[PDB]
Structure formats: C-alpha cells, structure tokens
Symmetry: C2
Subunit: 157 residues, 2 copies
C-alpha cells in the first residue's frame, strides 16, 4: 500500500494543463493524452472518459462540492499572490487568510471547482517568528508544535 | 510552488482514521486533532471546522461528487482484494477492472464519498507480461509506454 497519485477530474485536459501552468507554474511530467500527470503526481482526468471508467452517468459526477483541496507551499508567497491578483477570472474561495499557527495562505478554484490552497512555506513562518524576538521554544508553543518539528523545517529553507 | 498535501473533508475524524487504518492499513504520521495527516500526506479535515475555514454554509459542501480519487498501488494486490471482500459495508464504486495497459485495480469509497483506487503495482504488471513470453520492447508497446519507463519501475 503506497499512495501515489491524487486524481482530479476536469472538463478539458488542455485547458487545465494551461491553467495549472499559467497560474501555479506546474508542468507536465507524464502524458497519456486523456490522463496527464503534473509535477507532484497530480493526475488530470478527462470527464467523459472518467464516466466510462467508474460507470456513472454524467449526472452522477458533480463539481464544486468543496469537499477536498490540493495543498501547496510557495517560497515567494507574496510575489505569487500579487501576480495572482493581476490575473483575470481567478475564482477565489475566500480572501487571503492567516492560519492559527501564523501561516498566510490563499485559496482559489481551478477550472473545475477543485480547491487549491497555496500558503507560505512553514519554514518561513518559523523564521518570521524567530526574528521578531521569540525563542525557539516559544515559537514551538506559538504554533502548537514540537521543537523537533521546527528544527527539521529550518535546515531545509 | 511545491505540492505537499491532498486534503479530504470528513464528517468524523476518528471514524475515518479507523477506516483508513482498518481497510488500507494507513496510519497517522501527524496529528493536529481536527486535522490529521496519514501516510502519503493525505490530510483528513473535519467538516464543521472546514466550513469556518473556507466560509461556506453546510449546504455548500457536497460529497459523493465522484470528481476525484486517491490513487494507491499494493504489492500484495490479491490478498488485499480478498481481505476486502470479507469485510462488511465496503461501498464499491464498481467491480474490479483491468486497465487498458494490463493493470488490475478496484475502486471503493471511504466513509465520506471520496473515491479510493488501489491497483497492482505497475512493476508487477510489467513483470507479468515479461513472463508470459513478451519481449521488453513488446511490453512497452502493449502498455503504450517507453522502454525507458519500464526499466525504472522494474528496479523497484
């Protein structure tokens, strides 16, 4: 038992590939035509074909259920967010939020109602805290996590 | 930009943790209580809490949309499948299928309408073909892939 791929169903493979490339900078790493795999092992699957695979009528496949999300982290968070703001027809789920543990993140939909969240890298949230004057033990408490955790994220930035 | 987690929304964190553990053998690797991460970086998220996070009324969150799936591979595919058949209340999406490229796989739902697919490991599909007499070049053509690809998986 090994988890390998998250598959998302899309209406149009070429448009989604473009959306993920223009917006997230995600490129293809494997192509089967009707099923393409993006960096991170995110598989895009064409709907019509999908219907045959799982044997469900077109009515049995709903989108925008808001029941899951693809989660990403970006080193240059601000620049990404601000580039995202210059773009048109970006369907945001909500305004940019700040998680309980200090991490800024934004959430928007792809072309098919699938939620994408991209937030600051955890290691950068820590460093932000460590520079405002907090001790490492304090930071660990501030974020409801152990000092072990913080040290593993720090030596990876 | 680094993809880190697939998050799935569930009605009950403890029941899902149990479901993923009993059925797939998936254990927890990180716990925030209301948001638990399983092996593979699959994050379970409690619905009520989720509603607050993305600001949507309970009616705006639908399940069983069949618009995605979590994809797994298992070395001991048959034994897993047959263990799965002895269990009760397993919501299958469909009968066990065979993909165009030769791979057997089954699909079933978790406790919240999320689709799970677990299939044979690719390397085992390949090896199977290579033993029935096919050349490596033939296998690559049989599966619509390159010989480069097949050589990688066979060292796994």
């Amino acid at each position: 038992m090994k988890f390998l791929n998250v598959l998302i169903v899309v209406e149009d493979i070429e448009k989604s590939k473009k959306f993920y490339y223009d917006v997230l900078g995600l490129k293809v790493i494997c192509d089967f035509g009707e099923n393409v795999v993006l960096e991170g092992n995110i598989s895009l699957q064409e709907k019509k074909l999908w219907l045959e695979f799982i044997n469900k009528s077109d009515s049995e496949v709903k989108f925008n259920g808001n029941d899951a999300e693809l989660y990403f982290e970006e080193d240059n968070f601000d620049t990404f967010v601000e580039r995202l703001s210059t773009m048109k027809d970006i369907d945001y789920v909500h305004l940019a939020i700040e998680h309980r543990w200090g991490q800024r993140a934004i959430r928007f939909y792809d072309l098919d109602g699938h939620i994408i969240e991209v937030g600051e890298t955890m290691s950068s949230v820590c460093r932000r805290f460590l520079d405002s004057g907090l001790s490492i033990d304090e930071v660990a408490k501030r974020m409801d996590v152990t000092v072990e955790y913080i040290e593993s994220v720090l030596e990876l930035e």
